[PDB]
Write a protein that binds this ligand. Sequence first.
Ligand code: CLA
Ligand code: CLA
Ligand code: CLA
Ligand code: CLA
Ligand code: CLA
Ligand code: CLA
Ligand SMILES: CC1=C(/C=C/C(C)=C/C=C/C(C)=C/C=C/C=C(C)/C=C/C=C(C)/C=C/C2=C(C)CCCC2(C)C)C(C)(C)CCC1
Ligand SMILES: CC1=C(/C=C/C(C)=C/C=C/C(C)=C/C=C/C=C(C)/C=C/C=C(C)/C=C/C2=C(C)CCCC2(C)C)C(C)(C)CCC1
Ligand SMILES: CC1=C(C/C=C(\C)CCC[C@H](C)CCC[C@H](C)CCCC(C)C)C(=O)c2ccccc2C1=O
Lengths: 119, 119, 27, 154, 31, 731, 74, 61, 80
Amino acid sequence: CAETEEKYAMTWSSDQQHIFEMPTGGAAVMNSGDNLLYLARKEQALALATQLRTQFKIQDYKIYRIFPSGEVQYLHPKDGVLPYQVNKGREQVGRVKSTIGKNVNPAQVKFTSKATYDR
Amino acid sequence: PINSSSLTRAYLSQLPIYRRGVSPFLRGLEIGMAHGYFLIGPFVQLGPLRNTDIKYLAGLLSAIGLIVILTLGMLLYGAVSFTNDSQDLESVDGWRQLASGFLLGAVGGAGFAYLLLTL
Amino acid sequence: ITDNQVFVALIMALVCGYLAVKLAKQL
Amino acid sequence: VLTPCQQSEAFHKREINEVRTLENRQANYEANSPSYLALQSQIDQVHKRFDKYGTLLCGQDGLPHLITDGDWRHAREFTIPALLFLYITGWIGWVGRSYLKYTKETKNPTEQEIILDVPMALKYMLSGFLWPLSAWQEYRSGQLLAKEDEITVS
Amino acid sequence: SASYLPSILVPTVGLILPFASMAILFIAIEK
Amino acid sequence: ATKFPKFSQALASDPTTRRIWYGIATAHDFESHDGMTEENLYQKIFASHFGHLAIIFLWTSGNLFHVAWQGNFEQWVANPLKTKPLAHAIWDPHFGQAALKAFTRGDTVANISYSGVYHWWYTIGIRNNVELYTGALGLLVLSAVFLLAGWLHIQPKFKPSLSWFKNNESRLNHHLAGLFGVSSLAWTGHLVHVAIPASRGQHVGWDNFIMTPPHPAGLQPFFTGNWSVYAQSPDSMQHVFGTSQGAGTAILTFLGGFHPQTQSLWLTDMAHHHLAIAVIFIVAGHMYRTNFGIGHNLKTILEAHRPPSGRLGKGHIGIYQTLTNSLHFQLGLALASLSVVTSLVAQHMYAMPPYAYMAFDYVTQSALYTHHQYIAGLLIVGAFAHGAIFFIRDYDPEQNQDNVLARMLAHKEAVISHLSWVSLFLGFHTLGLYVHNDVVVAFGNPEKQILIEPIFAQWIQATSGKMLYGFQVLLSSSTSNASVAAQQLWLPGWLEAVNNESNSLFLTIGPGDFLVHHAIALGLHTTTLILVKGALDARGSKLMPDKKDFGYSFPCDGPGRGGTCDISAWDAFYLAMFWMLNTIGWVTFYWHWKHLSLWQGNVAQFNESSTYLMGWLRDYLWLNSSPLINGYNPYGMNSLAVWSWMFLFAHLVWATGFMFLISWRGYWQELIETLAWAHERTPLANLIRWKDKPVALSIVQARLVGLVHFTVGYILTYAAFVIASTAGKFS
Amino acid sequence: VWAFSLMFLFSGRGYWQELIESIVWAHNKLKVAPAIAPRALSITQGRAVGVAHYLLGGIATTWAFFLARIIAVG
Amino acid sequence: IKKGSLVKILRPESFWYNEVGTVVNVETSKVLYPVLVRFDKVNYSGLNSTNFSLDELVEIK
Amino acid sequence: AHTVKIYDNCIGCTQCVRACPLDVLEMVPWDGCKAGQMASAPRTEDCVGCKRCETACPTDFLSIRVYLGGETTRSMGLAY
Ligand code: CLA
Ligand code: CLA
Ligand code: CLA
Ligand code: CLA
Ligand code: CLA
Ligand code: CLA
Ligand SMILES: CC1=C(/C=C/C(C)=C/C=C/C(C)=C/C=C/C=C(C)/C=C/C=C(C)/C=C/C2=C(C)CCCC2(C)C)C(C)(C)CCC1
Ligand SMILES: CC1=C(/C=C/C(C)=C/C=C/C(C)=C/C=C/C=C(C)/C=C/C=C(C)/C=C/C2=C(C)CCCC2(C)C)C(C)(C)CCC1
Ligand SMILES: CC1=C(C/C=C(\C)CCC[C@H](C)CCC[C@H](C)CCCC(C)C)C(=O)c2ccccc2C1=O
């Protein structure tokens, strides 16, 4: 619950009082000026971001991740621009040099705490 | 929201946990004082020894046969969870006094029901 | 078919039980 | 032991039992009922059924067994419809292979398989009649087979 | 032939051993 | 380490209930733990083997103890045909009164023992309950010895080196000589000294065996090769087993055939048998080199077997590395050979029934067969499953550079295409012929059936002398080479056992042999289609060739690329368990409906009504479940109410399997959320909150637990039906 | 048919797709490669067909059982 | 090499491994996988259009 | 965590980031492709592992291959 799990409070603004759909379900009131929105998990929140962004303009939006210690986080975006768009600040992590075709065989990884792809 | 009214709160608030201050041996002794009077019932009419004159004693021995499992699970739940020592029901010591109160009050409720199957 | 041989058996598997729990909390 | 079936006892027991058992329904009708004529035709189709199984081998069960050794006394039992059958689905298989190596080289091989080109289809349906010495002579050119097709990792 | 030993051993392995084994294993989740 | 899984911290971090189920199911996967190295693996499995053998001997001492203490064993020895042998006693506090009168066999209310153990202990020559107590103590001692070794070889001064486990070079020299040759030769030391005299009346205990030799003259004038003295006076015809009357005194006579009276093998034949097998295995123990160095180096024994034809790769270069340094290849050969041994044992416990007054209790012979057959199929499926574990988590194609295994992964498309071909040939030609016979029989005509005589098995029975066919070849012809070549030795005592019809050796044969044996070969080639599929596409398929990376039993690859339900090498086990239970199903259904036709006598009931499927479901399942399903009535009950209650029970297990196999996770993963809301929101119980979070079972587990209820329901249903059926038509 | 549904319900196309493609090797060897590429069924079809056999076989069992029961007497 | 050339692959995780295919586009700006090759048949993603490097560029004549 | 790795087949068509409903994936300017892009997975602590990326990955065979690793609260996607 909220005293031990990371509540996700999504903060965003709009221009007109439209009506969207909650991920909990049903229609929501959608305060026109500015509205925050507590949720339960991140896929609900970015699924709501797809729910509103693919319909119309809801930019200047991001969930402040209420971790139960008390403070917030900020992820989508971080540099202010949309993630599949390309910004010159992001450092790529999570690559190897080639395809799966040069990944190591797991008998070369057996009895070691490695991966089947780090080489 | 709904089924959260003042009659709901006024009924729940004076239950034998949500009431403000009672010692945990008495707080569990009220729980056992109810449930030990309860669990004699569905062993006398429907139990297997309803045919001999052990209609009433089998409710005692069978019902305490449940109550030792019930308090045993109480000691498992306070043993695994509720690790801190804030001395109330959310503790180890207050929960095991809640369980001991449920045991002694439950056996007392068993004897009260057994001595009220006389009349 | 007798009585004390059964007690000898339960003592020997009590010892065997202590060797089982002796194997238990080391592997 | 497989007795010759025309003289086995339980065989003719099944003859009396099935002619009589099916004959029991034949007395339920008059001499000129259509059903009565139908069971006349059925009794005929049982006596013919048991006379035409004369050279088989029904053992102690009274039921005609078969032999698949190629003994050449049991050739009409197994091996003649064996070679006959292998000719028939060698026909079918060579028709299907020949039609797929037709539609492999066409304009759009996807639309070729929904809508069969009944001109070229019924070309290959009938032309694939002599698949031993046509499939064999297309095997001697090294063309029935292939090499270096798709495979997984090793 | 001790005809009384299953009257002791059958219940104490059948029911009360899956009480204390639930305590030893289930608290041994946290031990 | 600190959490539940005290061995892998990748699961202790998970606050759900996954840590429990994967903490249980990965407890024995020693190759994939946190920090369990190479020596620390072998030093764990070498101790847990001792714990396991301690469980075997605690089990056998359990059977010795209950037969010693609650059975009617020596009362059964007094009357082996009449008295039904008792298992352990009952203490139900649930039996009110009417069930208590449905078990009284003596003063105890014990179960009838359907396990053939009194027959084996009666051919051993135990004629007492006292010897069973001394044996039960004698295996509590041995189980305590193996547990003490399991504590002993995990104490750190005695945990051996890994090179000692890589002394593969000498385990075979010690096992084949000692474990097989010495234990088998000592087993003739039990047959000759106990099972020969205690079957010839002479009760020779531990007190008098060092005084009374099994031959009246022995071993001082008998290093001379005058060995016809030991096989001089055979027990010929007029003998009842156990007694001293009508019996000779020879030790190692090889008569061949059965007893005329008890329908069992001669114990002189077995003494000569394990003596010969003892000598040949001791000769096999002198095989490989050791610290002495007179034998065969195993690296020279595999690499030298390379054909100059060049077709079979670059020979076996690499195979000796990938059996020593690997384990699931060695375990795969172990379960393979043990599985063929179990299926062989089931194919000889009924065929040549070794034990006195078996083939006379018609249920224990039907329990042992189906027992070792389901264990046999389980162990094949395990051999292939560790085949796939070998190809994923144990296979190195660089020490196996174009090796025989690399050649196997190379042409695996042809292997799977042809197992799929022969499976597709049999399944249109048992189901083709059974639906033909079922349609044709259905239309008032058993004659128009396709019945093919299985000539090849009849011809092989003619090569072993079954003269009821009229082939007159090598052993059915008395004038051949082999028929004269052992005319005095073991032939004429054995063709009595062959040409007899009541005995279960080389059964009489109709076309049910033909059609069913095609259905069994269908079951084998399908099950190896699954297993060789998910054991050679275990490493890499063209759907996903990353399958070596995700380990063995990863769930899926998600809906990408068409959908990927059950791509893992765990589908070979998963699906081949259903085909294993199907196939051993058809084997033991077929065997059981064969011997229910022999023992009742109407083999014509089989041969006329087993070639069509309503012959099975009518004449076997519907008729032979009549004493089962009458196991308790509204009128009352009898002794088979346990087997009918177990019958309905195991239908409930077998159908709770389908809740997991059919209806997969995300239904329950979005329904346990509703239950968790219902408990988080309710009053008086939201205090009692969970610690491990309630999470529906992941689909590696879901198909497993559906598989387990499928097997438990299947096998308990059929063990209910074998025993209730044959116990209902007899006894 | 009831028992034949279980093959579709329990397994999935991650098995059957490269079982089938291991057969597509045996067609590519003899040039009998079908031009429409032979996939397995999809997942939802590969469970919809398990329903539609579980119900056809399951319903036709009670159909034949019922009409063969009451025609035989009534 | 060039566009339109019929190219066999030698990479084992290509779906079209040891199957020829036609070249659509080649970039000469040190892209690690520049040679875009599409095919007659179709992988499980529904997509014939893939791209490769130069070591896996084996043509026929 | 569910370790997402993004190999050098990633030609930057960005159906992966648009296909991920969790924003574990972003695009990084990488001068090795024609679009100059190659995807990155920095925030795999929120990675469910639902493989909705790998469906919409039109490379040769799966530039972005999701390996199912750790199982935290967020990576299991439980609501409560
Ligand atoms: C073009 C026709 C054709 C040909 C020549 C083959 C040939 C072959 N198939 Mg086959 N197959 C076909 C169609 C064909 N198949 C179709 C349409 C299917 C889908 C049902 C299959 C499914 C299939 C499986 C599942 C398997 C084979 C296998 C095999 C091989 C072993 C022989 C066998 O048992 O066949 C099997 C025959 C059948 C399953 C039934 C026959 C299929 C149809 C009913 C007949 C085909 C005629 C065709 C439709 C005519 C169209 C062309 C015409 C209109 C112009 C052999 C190379 C096996 C293998 O790999 O062995 C090495 C194997 O396991 N096939
Ligand atoms: C595996 C061992 C096991 C044993 C030994 C028993 C024994 C018993 N069960 Mg039982 N049961 C078991 C497993 C077992 N059950 C399981 C696995 C289930 C679930 C399927 C059930 C479900 C079940 C039901 C639904 C009922 C029983 C009942 C009973 C009692 C039978 C009534 C009778 O005629 O006896 C004579 C009985 C007596 C003389 C009274 C003895 C009662 C207890 C044992 C003594 C007093 C207990 C004591 C106060 C507490 C101390 C600690 C305790 C754990 C011993 C008997 C004590 C019946 C019952 O409730 O009995 C009253 C009953 O209705 N059982
Ligand atoms: C001669 C000396 C000797 C002997 C007697 C043994 C004996 C044994 N070793 Mg061993 N070992 C030795 C030397 C020896 N070892 C040496 C020198 C090394 C180091 C190089 C090892 C290294 C070693 C390892 C690493 C392991 C063993 C293990 C074992 C045990 C085998 C498991 C088992 O029960 O199978 C017994 C099998 C049989 C008795 C025969 C089964 C197969 C037959 C053909 C079928 C059944 C026979 C018959 C038909 C049925 C009768 C049954 C009845 C119901 C009728 C066994 C006690 C294993 C073990 O348990 O570890 C503790 C193990 O993991 N050994
Ligand atoms: C001598 C026999 C033998 C040995 C040593 C092993 C050893 C091993 N197997 Mg195994 N296996 C065997 C036979 C054997 N197997 C057989 C015969 C089969 C076919 C049935 C398999 C199928 C199999 C699979 C599919 C897998 C293994 C795996 C493993 C490894 C880890 C085991 C583990 O973690 O389990 C942990 C222990 C358990 C899960 C407890 C078992 C409980 C099972 C699931 C059900 C039994 C419950 C019972 C029926 C309920 C009782 C109720 C009653 C009414 C019946 C380990 C090396 C695994 C592996 O290497 O990859 C991870 C793996 O995935 N095995
Ligand atoms: C009744 C149940 C049933 C049946 C018949 C089958 C049958 C088969 N399974 Mg199987 N299977 C089952 C249950 C069943 N399974 C279950 C419960 C599981 C666990 C999920 C599996 C798992 C499994 C695996 C993992 C594999 C098989 C394979 C096979 C095939 C083996 C090859 C063969 O014999 O083809 C002969 C063909 C038949 C027996 C088909 C039946 C004949 C049909 C009914 C006639 C054709 C249609 C007919 C004209 C009616 C028309 C209908 C109308 C609407 C017009 C065969 C089709 C393997 C395979 O693909 O082999 C190539 C394979 O790898 N099965
Ligand atoms: C994946 C399945 C799964 C697993 C493995 C667990 C496992 C666990 N849960 Mg759990 N749970 C689950 C699903 C699961 N849960 C679901 C779906 C819910 C609903 C949201 C819950 C709700 C829940 C709560 C509310 C609690 C647990 C708790 C627990 C832990 C203690 C076991 C317990 O309380 O059961 C014990 C068994 C029962 C409660 C069953 C009661 C019904 C029985 C049959 C009637 C009693 C008959 C008789 C008296 C039995 C006596 C004999 C017997 C002892 C031998 C254990 C780690 C407890 C915990 O975390 O404590 C540390 C806890 O308080 N769970
Ligand atoms: C239907 C209904 C209902 C329900 C019911 C119920 C819920 C009941 C309950 C009741 C009960 C449940 C009761 C109780 C009783 C009890 C009492 C009245 C008390 C007394 C006391 C006691 C029991 C004591 C004990 C003891 C002893 C004896 C000794 C010592 C110890 C002790 C102290 C413990 C209601 C009302 C809701 C509503 C309406 C309707
Ligand atoms: C996957 C895998 C695997 C598998 C598994 C298994 C399971 C196997 C199989 C195996 C088996 C399962 C076996 C079988 C065998 C066979 C045989 C064995 C055959 C032959 C036959 C014979 C031998 C016979 C004959 C005869 C007679 C009849 C009489 C006279 C003489 C003689 C003897 C000749 C392995 C580990 C390998 C490897 C790795 C992977
Ligand atoms: C067997 C099986 C298959 C394979 C089923 C195959 C692909 C279909 C076999 C039947 C089709 C209809 C054969 C095509 C033949 C054509 C009809 C042409 C034949 C010529 C005449 C009959 C017209 C799956 O695709 C599957 C998917 C998901 C879960 C389980 C399974 C599954 O168990």
